[PDB]
């Protein structure tokens, strides 16, 4: 008995860990791997000519401690905003 | 074709909107509907054998504009924090 919410979150955690495990801390997502993740997972928005600095800017707004990575919470905040074109 | 992330997000929004459409504004979640959602969607963690105050507190924290509802961005911040036991809400 696994709910829709449990299934969806498990998928999000699984994708996040696949990319966070490629460099840096195993539990945070480097900027470079966020870029790769967005191209693979949200391809309808982050395509070939997506401005290289569209991510540079928004990645600064999200990386709270300025360590060059986002944790899962910061990551979900971004994905949720993109999907609803939230102000940020 | 739809990625794991697109599908999961669409699922989270669909569940949120199912409960948000039950009362008040169609696009926001009342406190009572949040409790119902959490018990049905994260039943192992929540339920009726839990503490009401747990929800009065978290609800006040999530309701950024103090209008008595939660938007999806605030809701998903909670769900994500729970699945990782994040310090924001876990004292
Ligand atoms: Na990492
Ligand atoms: Na960081
Ligand atoms: Na509502
Ligand atoms: Na609100």
From TrEMBL, chain B:
Taxonomy, superkingdom: Eukaryota
Keywords: Calcium, Metal-binding, Repeat
Domain EF-hand: 50-85
CDD domains: S-100
Name of protein: Protein S100
Gene3D superfamilies named among the record's database cross-references: EF-hand
InterPro entries: EF-hand-dom_pair, EF_Hand_1_Ca_BS, EF_hand_dom, S-100_dom, S100/CaBP7/8-like_CS, S100_Ca-bd_sub
Tagged with keyword Mitochondrion: no
Organism: Danio rerio
Record-level GO cellular component terms: cytoplasm
Keyword Calcium tagged: yes
């Amino acid at each position: 008995a696994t709910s829709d919410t449990q299934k969806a979150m498990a998928m999000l955690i699984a994708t996040f860990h696949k990319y966070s495990g490629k460099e840096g801390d195993k539990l945070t997502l480097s900027k470079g791997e966020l870029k790769e993740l967005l191209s693979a997972e949200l391809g309808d928005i982050f395509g070939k000519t997506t401005d290289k600095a569209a991510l540079d800017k928004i990645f600064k707004d999200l990386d709270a401690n300025a360590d060059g990575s986002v944790d899962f919470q910061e990551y979900i905040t971004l994905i949720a905003c993109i999907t609803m074109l939230c102000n940020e």
